[model samples]
Target: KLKVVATNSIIADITKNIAGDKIDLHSIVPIGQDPHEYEPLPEDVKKTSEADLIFYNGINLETGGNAWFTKLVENAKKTENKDYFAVSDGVDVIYLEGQNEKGKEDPHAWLNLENGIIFAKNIAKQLSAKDPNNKEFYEKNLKEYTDKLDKLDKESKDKFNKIPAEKKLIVTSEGAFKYFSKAYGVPSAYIWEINTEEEGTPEQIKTLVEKLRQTKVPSLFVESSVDDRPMKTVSQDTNIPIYAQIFTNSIAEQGKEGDSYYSMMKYNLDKIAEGLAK
Candidate 1:
């Protein structure tokens, strides 16, 4: 089996869809953990060295204590194109509007269905190149895989189109939904740009509270991987309800609502539509 490694479950899911059982897959970040805050251990480096091809969701999304991939690869003597590839390299990255990372790319490109297709295509191409004998297998599976992304993308756009314009605002604890907002023709406001020690600060909460009041948002959301306390506070402050959890940086655990990438998008869409329709 082709030894494949990915940074997070979203990347792992994308690669798994394209690679199928043909590859032995492993993810560096554990399930239900924040990839942005993950720190690699010696075992992670060992996994990197063992990988025939290392797949990651670059664009500095794997920052903070998680910036260990490059060093691991360098020490392993792995070549860039020959061994490692970033699934999100071709995606049009979104930037944080206000923060130290204001101009840097958002690494959560897989959350956008259009960019999700790019991720699948990138991995398929890489897998095909690395194992030429399975070229047809990879191409066929890639078509099957990306066709789902196209359908999901269209489904979201069509579904969200039916919601009234004024009801389309999505307020959340973190600004991770920017790409989802862009793809679905919805606008979003969040308490903070990225999760940090300073998350849910008074200034941040004050800013979002005003936005919620101005927009008269019916419901707000919290991510599955974060504390819902701050968002509950936002809801109480705005006299709105915290509708449903959205899966952002991490995929849902087994038997959960967003166990797969497709499930995550659909769950978020259904919840958003229900909330905004209120």
Candidate 2:
């Protein structure tokens, strides 16, 4: 079996779908943990050092801030594109806004099913390349995994289309929905641009409140991983309900509704439509 390490739980889950039991996989950031500010542990270092391959959600999800994952790769002496790789390497990136975050790409491309296909394909191709004997196995699994994603993607769009156009705005604590918005034809607003940026400041909250006041969106949302207080304040001021806790940074815990990537996306689509449909 190939020894594989993924930087975050979501990536690990996606790997599990395609690679199944053939690979010994570990997720460094743990389930439902924030990958952006993850502090690598000694055990994490040990796992990475011993792994034959590693996959990460890049575009600065792990490379930004303290550069934790980059440093881990450095310490593990894993060469990029050889021993370790970014699953988001081929994503058509959407850059962040604001002067401070300009030119930085959003790392949430997998939120879009099309881009998720890119991710799955990248994983399968890399897995097959690294362990050629399992090429057919990985390819077969990739088809099965992506077929489900394709079905869900269509279902999501069909459901989202039922939402009232005026009520289709998704207001959340963080702007993690640009890809999702683009994919589904809805707009998104948030207090903070990304998890790595300033979060829940009075200024940020005030700004979001004012925007929501002007826009009259139906509901506000929070992510599973972040502080929801700022968004709560926004909700109170704007009188919009805090509708749902969506998944972005990581999947929900095992046996939970959104435990896997497929379930997470499906849950988000259902809940968003429920909240905003009327």
Candidate 3:
């Protein structure tokens, strides 16, 4: 049986669909843990050493930092037999246009359903390459999964369109929803470029609070993977209701509603609709 090590929960869940009973899958970052700030324990090293394949979302999404990526690549090189694949291949990435001195691409491509299709295809190809005998099975699984993702894209669009244009602006702690906003036509305003940055400085909060009072956006949102204190503070000052949107930066506990990618997207869209419709 193939032993697969997925870097994060989202990747692990998608791999489960493609590998099914043919592989034993383990995720390095547990549910609700921030991948951006994740540190691999000794047990993680052991898991990586045992795996035949390791999957990462690459493009700097792993907040464990560049050292993590370099170390993983070095380990794979040493092993020679283990295959490491970046699942972000083939999808168009959003580059940080004018923020940091070192510009980076937004690594949250999986949030868009169309990009999710690309991820599924990439994973299928990797699985086929690693286990050639199961090529047909992986291909079939990819086709079915991509078809479902197509439906999801349409569903997300249909739901997003229901909100009036003015009410679609999304304000959050960081600019994590660029792809979501671009795909769904919801304009998003955010305080930070990345989640690891300090959220809502006094000036930032004052600016957003001014915007909220001026524009009267229906709501503000916080992500599932981060602390809500900042958003709550914004709410207290502005008196706008803050909604929890499940971006799922890490894995979810077992039996939680968004333990899978599809479920998580649905949960986010549902919350957006529920919050804005009020």
Summarize candidate 2's per-residue lDDT along 1-278 as a digit string, tens digits. 89999998888989999999999999999887788878999999999999999999888788888999989999999999999988987887888773345338888898888888888898999999989999999999999999999999998899888877878898888888999999999899988877545689999889888877877578778887788889888988889998888888788888889999889888888888888885
Off by over 4 Å in 2: 98-103, 195-197
What are the lDDT scores of the predictions, listed in order?
0.82, 0.87, 0.76
Best by lDDT: 2
Per residue, candidate 1 scores C-alpha lDDT tens digits across 39-90 of 7788888888898998878777674354667667788898877899888878
lDDT of 3 by residue, 1-278 (tens): 88888888888888877778888788888877766657788877877878788888876786335457557557646243247777888877777763543337788888788887878888888889888988898888888878877897898789779877777777887788887888888887876666345666887777777777766577888987667777777788888888766674754577888768878877787788777765
Which residue pairs in candidate 3 collide? Answer: 31-251, 36-63
Worst 10 residues of 1 by lDDT: 96-105
- Candidate 3 least-lDDT 10 residues: 73-82
What are the models' TM-scores? 0.94, 0.95, 0.91
Model 1: residues with Cα > 4 Å off, grouped in runs = 63-66, 98-103
TM-score of decoy 3: 0.91
Q: Highest TM-score: which candidate?
A: 2
Q: Total clashing residue pairs per candidate?
A: 0, 0, 2
Give Cα distance to truth, residue 201, candidate 2, Å: 2.1
